[PDB]
Amino acid sequence: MKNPQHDASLLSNSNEFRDKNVEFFASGGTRTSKFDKLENHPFLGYPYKRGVKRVIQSHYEPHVEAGGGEDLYGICIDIDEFSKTATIVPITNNFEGYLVAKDSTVKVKDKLIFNKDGALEKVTINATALTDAKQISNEVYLVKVAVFGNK
Amino acid sequence: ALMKNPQQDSGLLSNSIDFRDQNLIFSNSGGVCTSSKDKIENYPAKGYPYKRGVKLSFGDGTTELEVEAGGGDDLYGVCSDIDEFSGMATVIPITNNFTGYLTLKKDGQNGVNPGDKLNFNQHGELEKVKSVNAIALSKAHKLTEDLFIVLASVFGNR
Amino acid sequence: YSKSMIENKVFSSCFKSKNERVDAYSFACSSYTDKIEEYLYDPANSFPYKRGVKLVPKENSIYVEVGADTDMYGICVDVCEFSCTAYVLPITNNFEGYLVTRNPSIKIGEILDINNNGVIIKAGGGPPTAINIYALSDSFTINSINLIKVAIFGNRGLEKT
Known part of the structure; x- marks a missing residue:
C-alpha cells in the first residue's frame, strides 16, 4: 500500500536530509506545475505509481487499471484507499517523478515503455530514464523518468 | 545571432511614430499569442538554444541534466527565452502547443510559405518537410545574412 | 445549420437524460488549465461546431475548417455566430464530451476516428487512425443529428488498422 499504517514502539531516527525522498510513500511528482491536469478515477487492483488504462464495460462507469501499450491512458501518481479513487495525469501531460520499473536493468539515458502491467521496461517510446533503478523493498524498483507522451 | 538582445549598442534614437511591422526583432521573446494556462519549465542551458528546439542532454552523473539545441526523435520542447546571468533556458514542453517566431533553416527559406509543414532538424532549426506537427504561418524574415525567423505553430507529435 | 436554432406556441415538456441537446455544454467534465483558442471559420463552407477542425492560413487570416484526423489541429467546442468565431x-489537451457523428448505431467502448468532414465514425473504415478516440456512450439521435460522448487523449504512436 502507499501508506502501510503500522504502530511502532520506538521512534525511528530521521535527521539526514539526503536520500530521504526515494520511497514508495512519496506521492506526486518531483517537479509539478500549477497548470498540470489531474483527474480522479475509480480504480481496480492497485495501480499506484504505474501506467493506467481506462477499461469500459448492472452497468458501471469506466474505471482504470494497471496497463499500457496501445491502451495506455495515463499515469497514477496518488491514490485514496478510503474512497477507492486514483489521481491520474493524462498521457497528454508531461510528468517527472519516480515510477515502478520492471527490473534493475533500466539505467540512465534509457528509453522506456509502459508494459501490460504498467511498469517501465527498456525498449513507440514513452519515457526517458533519469536515474538508475533502485530497489525500495523486495522486487519493487523505482526509477526517475521524464514522461513526454508517445514517441 | 548568439544573443537575444543586440550585443552592440546604437548611435540613434528610435522614432516610435509607426505601429506596423515593429515585432520582427530577434529580442521578441515568448509567444505572439499566449495562454495563461501554459506550462513553462526552465533548465540549465548548454550552448545557445534560444528560439530553437531543445533536447535533453546528460553527463557523467556528477551534474544535473541540461537542454541543448536538437530535434528529430530526441526533441523535448521549444526554447522561448534565456536568462544569460543564470544561464537558464525557458522551455515549453512539446505536450503544450506553442505559436511564435522560431529560427528557420537557411536552406530553401524562400520555399517556406503559409500552410507549409515544418519539422525540427538536428540543430533545432525548423526545416521544410515526420513525427512532430508544426505548420508555418508566415514567410521567412531575414534578420542577418544567415539568420531567418518564421512564425510557426507547434501542436504536438504526429 | 446553427446551435441555438425560434418562437414556440407552447413550452416543451426527471433529471435523467436531459443533456441530449444539440446546444448542450460540450465538455462533460471541464477543468481549469484547459487551453481554449479563438479562430475565424468559413461562414458558407462548413459549420465547425462540435467537429474536428484544421488550421488553414488564408491570405487575410488564419481560418479553421472541418478536417480529418491526419491533419487535425483540435476540436471546435463552441461558436459565436454573431462574430463567426470558433x-x-x-x-494537445484532453477532451471528454459530446461530438457529431454520422453513424446512428455505435456502441460503448468502440474505437473511433474523425473523417474528412470532422465527423466521428467507426475506426474500422480502413483509414489508419492517428488519434486515441473511444466511445463513452451509445450514439443518440436528436430529431436529425447524431451525437455521441467520446474521450480524446492525444495522438496514437503507430497508426492502427
Missing part, C-alpha cells in the same frame, strides 16, 4: 481546444 473556439478550439487543441489536440
Whole structure:
C-alpha cells in the first residue's frame, strides 16, 4: 500500500536530509506545475505509481487499471484507499517523478515503455530514464523518468 | 545571432511614430499569442538554444541534466527565452502547443510559405518537410545574412 | 445549420437524460488549465461546431475548417455566430464530451476516428487512425443529428488498422 499504517514502539531516527525522498510513500511528482491536469478515477487492483488504462464495460462507469501499450491512458501518481479513487495525469501531460520499473536493468539515458502491467521496461517510446533503478523493498524498483507522451 | 538582445549598442534614437511591422526583432521573446494556462519549465542551458528546439542532454552523473539545441526523435520542447546571468533556458514542453517566431533553416527559406509543414532538424532549426506537427504561418524574415525567423505553430507529435 | 436554432406556441415538456441537446455544454467534465483558442471559420463552407477542425492560413487570416484526423489541429467546442468565431481546444489537451457523428448505431467502448468532414465514425473504415478516440456512450439521435460522448487523449504512436 502507499501508506502501510503500522504502530511502532520506538521512534525511528530521521535527521539526514539526503536520500530521504526515494520511497514508495512519496506521492506526486518531483517537479509539478500549477497548470498540470489531474483527474480522479475509480480504480481496480492497485495501480499506484504505474501506467493506467481506462477499461469500459448492472452497468458501471469506466474505471482504470494497471496497463499500457496501445491502451495506455495515463499515469497514477496518488491514490485514496478510503474512497477507492486514483489521481491520474493524462498521457497528454508531461510528468517527472519516480515510477515502478520492471527490473534493475533500466539505467540512465534509457528509453522506456509502459508494459501490460504498467511498469517501465527498456525498449513507440514513452519515457526517458533519469536515474538508475533502485530497489525500495523486495522486487519493487523505482526509477526517475521524464514522461513526454508517445514517441 | 548568439544573443537575444543586440550585443552592440546604437548611435540613434528610435522614432516610435509607426505601429506596423515593429515585432520582427530577434529580442521578441515568448509567444505572439499566449495562454495563461501554459506550462513553462526552465533548465540549465548548454550552448545557445534560444528560439530553437531543445533536447535533453546528460553527463557523467556528477551534474544535473541540461537542454541543448536538437530535434528529430530526441526533441523535448521549444526554447522561448534565456536568462544569460543564470544561464537558464525557458522551455515549453512539446505536450503544450506553442505559436511564435522560431529560427528557420537557411536552406530553401524562400520555399517556406503559409500552410507549409515544418519539422525540427538536428540543430533545432525548423526545416521544410515526420513525427512532430508544426505548420508555418508566415514567410521567412531575414534578420542577418544567415539568420531567418518564421512564425510557426507547434501542436504536438504526429 | 446553427446551435441555438425560434418562437414556440407552447413550452416543451426527471433529471435523467436531459443533456441530449444539440446546444448542450460540450465538455462533460471541464477543468481549469484547459487551453481554449479563438479562430475565424468559413461562414458558407462548413459549420465547425462540435467537429474536428484544421488550421488553414488564408491570405487575410488564419481560418479553421472541418478536417480529418491526419491533419487535425483540435476540436471546435463552441461558436459565436454573431462574430463567426470558433473556439478550439487543441489536440494537445484532453477532451471528454459530446461530438457529431454520422453513424446512428455505435456502441460503448468502440474505437473511433474523425473523417474528412470532422465527423466521428467507426475506426474500422480502413483509414489508419492517428488519434486515441473511444466511445463513452451509445450514439443518440436528436430529431436529425447524431451525437455521441467520446474521450480524446492525444495522438496514437503507430497508426492502427
